[PDB]
Design a protein around this ligand. Sequence first.
Ligand SMILES: [Ca+2]
Ligand SMILES: [Ca+2]
Ligand SMILES: [Ca+2]
Ligand SMILES: [Ca+2]
Lengths: 323, 323
Amino acid sequence: TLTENKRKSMEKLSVDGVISALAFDQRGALKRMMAQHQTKEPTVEQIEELKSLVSEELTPFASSILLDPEYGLPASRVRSEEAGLLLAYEKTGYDATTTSRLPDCLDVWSAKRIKEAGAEAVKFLLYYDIDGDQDVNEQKKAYIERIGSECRAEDIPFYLEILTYDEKIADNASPEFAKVKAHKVNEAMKVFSKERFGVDVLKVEVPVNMKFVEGFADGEVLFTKEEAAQAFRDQEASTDLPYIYLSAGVSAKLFQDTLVFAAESGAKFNGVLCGRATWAGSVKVYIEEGPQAAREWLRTEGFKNIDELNKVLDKTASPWTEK
Amino acid sequence: ITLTENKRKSMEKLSVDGVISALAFDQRGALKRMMAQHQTKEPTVEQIEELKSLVSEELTPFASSILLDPEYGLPASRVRSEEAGLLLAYEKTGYDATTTSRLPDCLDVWSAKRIKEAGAEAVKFLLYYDIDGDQDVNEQKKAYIERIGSECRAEDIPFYLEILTYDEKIADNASPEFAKVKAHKVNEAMKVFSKERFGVDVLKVEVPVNMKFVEGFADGEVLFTKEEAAQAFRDQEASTDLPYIYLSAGVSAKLFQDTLVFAAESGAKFNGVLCGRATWAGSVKVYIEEGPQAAREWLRTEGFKNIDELNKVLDKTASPWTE
Ligand SMILES: [Ca+2]
Ligand SMILES: [Ca+2]
Ligand SMILES: [Ca+2]
Ligand SMILES: [Ca+2]
């Protein structure tokens, strides 16, 4: 039961109950990508400019765009008139030195300032290991409670992104992690669907690593199609909140086929916040060839990525205007 | 300006006839240091919890409410008089003496929601503030308070903000040097955090002058005339439209009482106190050296006389926040 203002904001972020959002709040990760292609340190100006190019060129094809408030405010002002705005609230990355990956809001931001910056939603990323240290998870749960309350007070939708991991498993791309991924994703969704966290939409991973699923796997096969399908149904049974998928930087084609698979399996997902799968290739072009060359990439390859995604969404996603 | 139904009810549970006569005992680090000067062994969790419980049980029948910390004070909160309301502290104790920023930090496993669930009628938070300090540091502080203010709005619980002033370049706030800038530090901080965006319901603040340097109150050097001190109280009264209450800062009970009289005479419309050390400080030595039963008797006699004597002064000095 959304308040009047939260519903209006949700409408601004969606079309006919489906969220077809573009994600570009990447910061540290984006800077590292740019650094691969030039000698000099990527500048604040370059980061701000690439974000503006992506926003201006691709938001006409998205129901909304997620940006960070650190570099993305200029980009937010050139988004399509029909597209809504989400702003990220978390500091970028995490400490690889430890296993706790504790959440931390941007130092000079608050839900109120995010709303004042023109956002229709506050987005926050939490790393979560359901099987992790209980005191660490207690601190994480308390942190999300605070943000949930902020968003209730400011009357702005709270989008919580959850990225799972295992304290003892170094690489989430490994077969070892793939075997526990469904558990990590689905149980974390169940926790954060509790009323006390104030979440309006969950941004989550697919509960399987498709690279290990029969029909998609090019190497070791860990799961039959029926086993993978059951993980999607388990995900659907973990929450009654709206939820949308992140791409995790797989290829545009794989993400598309994954959504088709999710839908056939019985996942009633409500759209996507898709970032890297759409715009990844623009970074090299921007750095090596400049702004105009990036625009031309975005109008051809970038458009192809988001256009094919939109066609898939049209035949796979379920409207949140039912829940 | 305007309290919700629930905030008003909670405010009433914290006061008597619009006057806040609250007993403060959320001291942690400071309390531990106090206990450590009367015994050889390190103060234990049990000692800290017990003393808090003794003070709560013996003195709350004479207080409109009690402020405790969630870390050690929850048992004590449960033995308070049925007539006394409860405030719980939300900040971590103390500050890093090595740096000058004194940045605020909430207790790691707490939230406004959990404070309310633990039975509190108010969330209390302590912020150190230097109005003339580093502007970026202060921006971070203001953002942090906005968040807490929003949390408290969402949970519909009164937000008590305590402000302790300091100067980044003055080591000792008891010095004549600090005394000369205190009115400025205090009154200007109250102006800042009285803005609607911070969501404060009550300000817990220092008196805007160091009375020990005021003519007629000073036993040593005299820095201010009574008229000058009086003008600082009037300036404080004009710095906020919110209810505000005084902390004792650990001055003697006699000086604090005289200060309240002088405040009212000068034109301050303060609405009560959150008074701690000036009331129970004396029980620490007795408890450590002599034990709980001994401490209990000090409380039923000297403790009661302290608080009863304070109450009689409040009866003639405080103004009701019904405002
Ligand atoms: Ca279109
Ligand atoms: Ca529920
Ligand atoms: Ca469901
Ligand atoms: Ca006297």
